[PDB]
Amino acid sequence: QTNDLKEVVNKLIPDSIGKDIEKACQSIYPLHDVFVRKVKMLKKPKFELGKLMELHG
Amino acid sequence: AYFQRPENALKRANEFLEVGKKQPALDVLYDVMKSKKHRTWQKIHEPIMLKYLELCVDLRKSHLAKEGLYQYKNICQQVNIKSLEDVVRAYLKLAEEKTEAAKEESQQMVLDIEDLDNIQTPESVLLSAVSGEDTQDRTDRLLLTPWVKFLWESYRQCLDLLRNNSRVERLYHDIAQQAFKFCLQYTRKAEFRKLCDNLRMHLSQIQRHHNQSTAINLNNPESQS
Amino acid sequence: EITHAVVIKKLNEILQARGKKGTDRAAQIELLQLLVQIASENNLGEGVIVKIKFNIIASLYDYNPNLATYMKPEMWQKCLDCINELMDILFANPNIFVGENILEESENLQNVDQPLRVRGCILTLVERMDEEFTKIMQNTDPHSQEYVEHLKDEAQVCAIIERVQRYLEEKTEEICRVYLRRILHTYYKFDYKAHQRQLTPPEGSSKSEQDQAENEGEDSAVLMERLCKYIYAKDRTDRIRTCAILCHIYHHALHSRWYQARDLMLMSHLQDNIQHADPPVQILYNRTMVQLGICAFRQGLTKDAHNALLDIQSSGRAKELLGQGLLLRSLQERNQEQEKVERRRQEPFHLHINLELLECVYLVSAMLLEIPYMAAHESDARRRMISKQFHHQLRVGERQPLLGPPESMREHVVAASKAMKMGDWKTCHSFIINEKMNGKVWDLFPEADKVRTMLVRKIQEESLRTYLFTYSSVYDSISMETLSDMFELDLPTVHSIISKMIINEELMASLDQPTQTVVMHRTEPTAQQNLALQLAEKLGSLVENNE
RNA sequence: AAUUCUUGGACCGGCGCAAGACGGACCAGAGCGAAAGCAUUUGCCAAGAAUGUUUUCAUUAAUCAAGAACGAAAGUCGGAGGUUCGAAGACGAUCAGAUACCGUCGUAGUUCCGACCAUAAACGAUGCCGACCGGCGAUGCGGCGGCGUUAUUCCCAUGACCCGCCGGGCAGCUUCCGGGAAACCAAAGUCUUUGGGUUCCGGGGGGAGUAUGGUUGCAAAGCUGAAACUUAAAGGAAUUGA
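The joint structure predicted for all components is written out below.
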């Protein structure tokens, strides 16, 4: 929610989200094989090129 | 398992750091040092341990740098001990610079913030002045002492566990000398413990004479020098 | 929104989910906050918020399920505000508002047992708040700045035990509880708070009516302590007159005279009573008993301090003043002790108290008993510095002392080779950082006391030690040497003869003391009578047993 | 194999869109429900057994002709829908024949809303309530006591394991409790040493759940339900053969 798409992919390249959830749910019931199974894309903003060429260096 | 090809630990460690999670980045490197991959020192084991001890400093976890080096000394036994020398010198080097920065930080920015702040004695500063002393020690304890109490605990652990006797280390005596000069920069009551440390480790040598260890006799290096 | 019928029946179903396992805990204060902010009418928002306002701040102490833990800076802050909105509405509307009839609603809480102790439910919030604050101080690194950042809230806590002190519509007789809670935040307060509003010379500096309303709170003890003495000695319970008077004694100390205080200690008879008392008061006794001799020391009485501060420092458990010490013996009971540990700022300093049992003895032992120590041993007091003098002398190496006891010795060892110069110069070397001058809350004067008891107690030395070939001596030049007043030297040089029965003669119209001592190789055959008595003093004891 | 589909580009790969079904693996001799039955997430609504209790009322209870609520699937009438599957159908095979099994299509139906229907190997082929009579180790829910491991680092206190105990529940293994024609059964035991209470219901096999009347239903059909006649057996468990 709080940061942009360049940084959410930087989180999905490890599995920082899955490791964070796994450590958080240790008190309720210890989970082990925790991942973000799938990411889907529903909506994109109207295409920009300057925003693409920042992502391409 | 965790890994095949132990160099991948560096890539996961580096990937986690770009997000800014040095606790699980350290967990990755910790899992590789203690596993099947105990092959007597791979060329990639140095950059792993260099990053490992950088993160151990940045988080301040002496008891992890203990276990890390304790594993390393084992996987770089008589194969090559230059690796131990380079690693542990670079560890204590990194910790010394964190304390250098920590003082200069607290002693130019925050020390000037301290006597920038209105000294004109309110009730809260006057009440504590039947037990307590100056504001600089009162807030230098908040931003410097956790770094010098780490430098001490870093030195003592590097001496005690790792280099008990073990003839092949002149580094042991280098550390001892460096940590005596460390006491001229900071606290003194962590120097009586240092003396007692040398006393018991010397007592530990000439009581047993029972391992591939220091023969304190005509041997000029490991007796005189 | 309607006829207080939809706010006495929504305040009777959100303080009903209180304590329950599905409490919420946090967003229950919000629904007690959204029955005052959507309460915007008279007797539906601007009359009877009081009954809600009791249970909006009572809802803030229940946020923490434990009673051993402390409110966070956020929670602690908002409950110092919500206790004051209580007092915004209970000051400028003089009446009772959890009952005591006026019109009909939304007051008149008679049907509820007593509309008097639900009314006395404000003193028990400011008493619960007084105790809640102490936990904020018990759980901070006391050598950190975060201690000072929290002690800035002590101007804000002392305010509300004063704002809800003046409020005299109690329902003297029954107010004494908030009196003790007030005096408890005044009893350990220092000189420059209690003095430097009396001591600013009362002229056109402080002689207007409300400029002399900062002059209320120096002796607030005079008024409120006797009220917690002779209403409470008439009334039922015990606790608030045992505690009340020791706060009085401790506050007639460290910025007032001994004679005023010591009388109160002996009036109440707590020397031989505080045995069946509870520990929470049994420490306040120890705190008082220690400050007694510390302030006796401050004025001059340097042997009255000694014989009072023996039974405290004698123990290895000298932490009956402070945060407790070492090894095991029932851990569950030692967790009933970390909730007793008194607050850091209040603590009598220990490197300051050990430096009054090696600085009082040093003037009652290394002076009183350097007379009979030349071959006349049957007066040796067997509890003194030799506790430690056998230690810091049985060391093969010493230099310029570093510790307290050697820095309380290396001027003592020259106080044998009197040297007024050398001994005065090593109780004021590097102690004004290490608690001698600063800590004893009298800035320079305790040294003016010490210096005098160094200047004087070093003229009473050549008298007792270095008199062998001294027959004709000087007592004008002796005043020039050591710089004391001629009468304050003409007194003790006179005392030297009668008080210490010395073999030296006097005609003090000339101010002189001819000696004619001869004892030197005559006390040797008397040093034979140190033992020729302990032959024929034994035949006195032999036939006591025989028959 | 053929019927069928396709150079008017089928099948295959890619990106989109729409529709109507269904809720994989996790999923178990696990749970809940009076039975039929019940599984993606979250919210709202009312209900419920079990445990806990030094609360309350004080015999208010058990089983039940009449009467009544729910009742898989198929079936019927009216409305919306029709992706998959698919009685009848239409062909293609197989075969001596094949009105079948195998294949390609395919209508009613399969799904939802509102009205009927009231039967199933609706099964534990085993009425409900109460008492007594062996052992053992698990399992689900609630409570209680207890070394220690672990997550909240700050551990009080909560969860996850670990070791027992108590009460209900789905089951399991074991035995000369005992019963039984046996198979098997902690009930199918406590039965010639025969009686705790109470409802339904069977009387050799066929004819026959047939005819006839009556009753419910739009219909299909449901519930109640014989006789003449016919016959020395039909049958249940277990053993040896083939």
